[PDB]
């Protein structure tokens, strides 16, 4: 009587998933969000007088990924599907640039949000249909991790998040994570609890701990390998309309505590969203968290698109401005990494 | 209290009434809209190749014996050679259109090939479109296996099928479609009828708890399970009376009587075996829900056998189609 | 190939089913005669009677020896003392009940205790030694059990909380399985209090959630629904609701919540009636029965106030015995026929 | 904001965390001296000593009066009598313990009972009266509790079934919450027996399912993990397994199963061991500690065999006190050093 090999992730894949997961959530570093859609790229390119063409998107993302030494501060890069199959102007596959900097490619694989019937606009995350085939293709193209956004909200008067909300989120997250790992992708698990409301931080801690207990029990039920998975929740914070906002030390305290109360330490890392300005509250919050411990999980940042805002402004679509632009990107990347510690 | 917490009185009434009509006394559901390939096996006994849908739909009086018809999506938008939409022909007969909306099966990772049913993505939009085109019920098939040595059906299997069914059902009702819930427990294996009874009760308990959690209106839903039987390689086959007994017991043990009907899958049985089993079930006193057995395949079969591929036999082909529809229908009374 | 020890035996299943069917008779009801020494002290004081064991025996003899009472009473709840007690003329109480075909039963829980770190939400205690108690009670002639679980409705405080529901359903399932392991019919009692100003739609919602969880739990614990009974509260508005539901509304919602959650294998559903034929509960169950035939039998578990006028008529003095019994006989009668 | 009644207070949380941290000391272990009157009657009969309260008191006093014992002992399990016992010089046993910094605790469950219609799978009884017992125990000086749950592994029979796991988790979480509501640290004890021929991978799989369920339930019942301790079996092959695991494998899978399921807020995990320094468990725990620093402390809860040599050195002779204590001391020392 033994466990069948078909019931476990193989040695090869478990080692790959663990190694990649560990590299992606590096404390010195962060994930570059370079996955704007055509529609979002239009707004950005417009701000600098650049025409939104496929070729120019290739110029822009070559500008990002070919920045010499970026991998010292950037652990991974989120790509739009177009970019995953795209070559630079000089003929170099985007994934090859990333590889040259040791930056790990990833991609969003969900199909967005849909209201759960008979809830007060509480949301399910869709995308399981054809997800395995997508993950296979993506891995073959060079992606090594996935994203999948789930959303919960807090509203005590309306009983949010309802049981159904939490059940759905946990199930979707677990299915998506197992499917990812079946296709050799590290899943980034993302139960995002919105800050909408005037609840204070203790409420957010309570909700967070309940949601995370549920999510990890679900991950265990679906045979998800925590050693090859990552967690990206919101930090534990007061609601945006709370009249008594938490301090950075408090946010650090409650976030570390919720994680330690619910996250098994087999999970190698927990990441949080930062808007990529080194002085912003998310930086301060994470720095305060790192002052504590050290922890059973690596802490790291997933950077919003604004990280490369100045890079864009420096470049302006002008070839001659590449070096300058890339210099700027480095200094932002470095400074955000350093701000964590 | 509150507004968007409940199904409206209007919609709940429509769903309840349509579920009632679908699971009507003395009637069955016609399953004769079939694909290109699957009618090669069907044709090659009658030996014609390539109107048929017209032959099925233009059969006057069929509503007496047929409560619903299963259509493909394309058929919903299709018109008669006289410009009449197929769904308007079905409507004139009082026959309710329905459609299978799941996207088939996919292995649950790290299980021994137990299956998730796929198809929630875009499902709500599809359902809205189908209602607009005239569909009033939907069908979703989940599959589970029995294998005591391998712990099948596993907790993950049961959990996934219950989740997918409840999700599907809630979405259907959100788009004014009656959901037909089909948790199919395969008869593979050597287990006897007591094992199937035990598993069926566990599965249906999980499924109806999930349906409650997802706010599914039972009054506007329908259940389509296998009858409870011995496994196909079982050395001690169950009698008709035993099948009746354990099937009725499993249902009474797990299914709230707000559900208007239970319409059994053919499950690999003969038409007359299924008829006999249902008869033994009817012997077992009045039930809180309508019980039906499936026979669309047999109807389509004998109609095709009458047709033989010649345009001359149309009338005859329709007459027998009515006759058999009657015989099967009245067998359920 | 399922195995013997995984299911209630045929004989015991038959016994449980038959006793359950008998307990939930439509024209009849359960007599609540299980006053504690203290309660019975109170309303013995109400008629100037010294609360002694002998006088309690007099009183319950007077109840259970009413000739014909079995036409309107299907079961009787006893205090433990009474289960082992003889009438003053030497007849075992259970023998008196058996002569009238009245089935004896008894409460087996040990009351309520707050769930830690909840807002005063309650677990029902009583599982320790419960099996042994049921065995002995059966041995003494008991054939059904009672176990009160409590939940509250409070939207502002998220009540009933998931932990409340989970605890109640676990404890109920546990209790019921043990009962049946000792050949007792368990009366499953998830009582949802009427505290609050919520209207009837809120109570219907909560009742349906709670009952769904309860019956899933009963299934998880291998409980035989065929040999069990349910006694919930009727679905109603809150005691402080400004817009109260009507009798017809109450019937509609109660029947609907049951049909939406209770599997038909369950042979009966009982409700609390205060023992008067004209009160709200009677009219409610009446509207319920007017609403066509049901998968479950509907019945009444009468409160200790039913035999009150019998006690007033008795006044402890022996000469009134017959008289007292007459009163009882009519009372039950009036309460029986009113259900249908 | 969150209600203060929804959380363990700062003072109590701090007390629980500190006591838990002290109990799960890596260089130490828990002394088990909670024999009942019968058990101690057997152990005394082994060395020709009359089993009286006087002699029991002498024995307990000899154990707990060992000066310096607090170096290798962080806790002591007492039988209820011992908690209220005094030395011949009138010093409370718990005060002797306090002087050595050794923390007292007590087993509070009421043993196992078969879950109905299971193949003799066991529920743990003891929740009735548990809160009151815990309050009294704390008042007498108790600071931790023990509660043993038992599961088995049998693939052909589908053990541990869902009901077994569900029950174990429910009982453990209720008990944990009640302890913490009375300021006791609960040691949570989901014991998975080694009966069977399965190999270590099966045990690991089962352990991970069981622990996942236990910890979800601990969360559902608002159990403060910072003030709790876990005491599972090590992950090993079954006792009849033909292909036994190595010490390194046992360490690997045990550590893995814990890291896969146990949140790092839990200060420590303790395993069961005999009083033998070079026994399997000691080498296993040793192999575990070598696997770098862990998110929780690893420790030992010793069996009643630890003091067997002390008990034998005593010989019931008062003059033999001083030496016997040395025998315990040494016997403790090795056991502490064989862990790290």
Residue numbers in the entry:
A (entry chain A): 15 to 355
B (entry chain D): 17 to 66, 73 to 355
C (entry chain C), D (entry chain B): 16 to 355
Quoted from the paper:
Here, T. gondii fructose-1,6-bisphosphate aldolase has been crystallized in space group P22121, with the biologically relevant tetramer in the asymmetric unit, and the structure has been determined via molecular replacement to a resolution of 2.0 Å. As we did not cleave the purification tag, we expected a full-length structure containing 355 amino acids; however, the first 14 amino acids, which include the purification tag and a portion of the 3C protease cleavage site, were unresolved in the structure. When we look at the orientation of the arginine residues in the TgAldolase structure, we find that the corresponding Arg58 and Arg319 are shifted or in alternate conformations. Arg58 resides in α-helix 2 of TgAldolase and we find that this helix is shifted away from the binding site compared with the position in the PfAldolase structures. In order for adhesins to bind to TgAldolase, this arginine would need to rotate out by 90° to allow the tryptophan to insert between Arg319 and Arg58.
It invades different cell types using an actomyosin motor that is connected to extracellular adhesins via the bridging protein fructose-1,6-­bisphosphate aldolase.
